[PDB]
From a paper:
CodY from B. subtilis and most other low G + C Gram-positive bacteria is a DNA-binding protein that is activated by the branched-chain amino acids (BCAAs),2 leucine, isoleucine and valine, which may be viewed as signals of the metabolic status of the cell, and GTP, which may signal the energetic status of the cell. The structures of full-length CodY from B. subtilis determined here reveal the effector binding domain and the DNA binding domain as discrete entities separated by a helical linker.
Examination of the molecular packing in the crystals of unliganded CodY reveals that the basic building block of all three crystals is a tetramer. The tetramer in the form C crystals and one of the tetramers in both the form A and the form B crystals are generated by crystallographic 2-fold symmetry. In the crystals, four CodY protomers are assembled into an unusual tetramer in which four wHTH domains are sandwiched between two GAF domain dimers. For the unliganded form in particular, the tetramer is compact with extensive subunit interfaces. From within this tetramer structure, there is no possibility that the wHTH domains of CodY could bind to DNA in a conventional manner, because the GAF domains of partner subunits in the tetramer occupy a substantial volume that would be taken up by the DNA duplex.
Author numbering:
A (entry chain A), B (entry chain B): 2 to 256
Amino acid sequence: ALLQKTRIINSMLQAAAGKPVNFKEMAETLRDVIDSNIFVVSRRGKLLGYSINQQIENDRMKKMLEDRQFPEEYTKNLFNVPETSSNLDINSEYTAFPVENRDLFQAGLTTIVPIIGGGERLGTLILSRLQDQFNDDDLILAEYGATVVGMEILREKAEEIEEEARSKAVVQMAISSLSYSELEAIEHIFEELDGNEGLLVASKIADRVGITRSVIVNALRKLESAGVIESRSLGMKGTYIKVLNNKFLIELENL
Amino acid sequence: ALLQKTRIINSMLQAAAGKPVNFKEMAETLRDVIDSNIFVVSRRGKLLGYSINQQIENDRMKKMLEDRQFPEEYTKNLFNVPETSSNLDINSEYTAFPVENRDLFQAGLTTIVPIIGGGERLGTLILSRLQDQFNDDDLILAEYGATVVGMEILREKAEEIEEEARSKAVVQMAISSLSYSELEAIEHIFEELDGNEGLLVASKIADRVGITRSVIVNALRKLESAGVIESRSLGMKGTYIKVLNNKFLIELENL
């Protein structure tokens, strides 16, 4: 019953809007829609999700469902596949696969669609039934489905790193905003500290370090200012901090 | 064969990848694989791109094709469509459209798809033949179709501002690294200046402003460093400069 079938696939997509990416509850969707087996493997060939409904004969797939890694020779060509291969097992004649890719498709009549977003193969969609041949409708669905879980990892991954170089801009911001002293204080602080959690009253360092309180006491708050650290001191008599940004200590040690 | 017609689409989708989003050249690729009229209009109702073959009886649409600005009464109810209107003109019986959108659909047995990604109705997609019914799959194409133009405005507008908020980003930079002095200078400079184009001679400012050539002449380079302005000084005897970022000048005035 076509169109609905998809409109349904679409229904699902619209819906992932805010909610962060989630393959499985989306693999399901394809399973449901296409009534097929569904496994999504990334470029690196880690399964990000899959789903099923009845047991199978495929011995050489589970290996990965236990270490997330699939070895540097197997999934390897699984990737070399230039296009969709339509209907597939262990008894059809073709010289499109080399004799080093024998057992990967294995059990349940398997079909294959490459996931292919922003100009790049981001991975593969395995589908694999047992009996019912893979219909022209049935394909069209996957191709949408792939195309969908296409610009999704895309999405997910941008998300994933656009908030790396957030953190990372942040930190060379604040650090960009200290005096030779202030930062030197900060420096000497965490050289003589451990982790985000830190307590040793500023008072102490000053005399040792030979930077006034006043300042040390301040470099400090400059970080309260672009978030990076937290303390809300307890009337001197001890001074404690914890950090709000992992990429920091890192950077700071990068000095 | 519909699938072909679909995969054909796919192929054009991969091959936008690098190339900067082109609507027409996809409006066509629709009007190809669908065999109909394609018109992509937006949230605000601008016709981004379109694509036809024969001559048409819609009068009330040749309006936007010169001002790009559709009425605050037409496109809007065009916006109001909760979902895909399958076939249309002006003889049928329906209590959807409000008594204020009679002639927008005018020519071509018209059909309607809303474009929705980033969990947002990005705009509307308009197909319109003359006789042939829009079939099931005619839809099926059309929709996915949208869905692409879909996450294309996404990519374009995404692209639009990750680079408006670049300018801004770099100018808040450059400036931010200006000593009060230096800043004082660039200031005094452009206040007695007109547009991105300037020839006024450093020597003469210092005095008139109370600052060393030393520093004027420093603060200038600084912005060429961060490229914001161009000058290749001449051997004094007249300095001439140019601004290479619009956002900049704006920002100055906002200090």
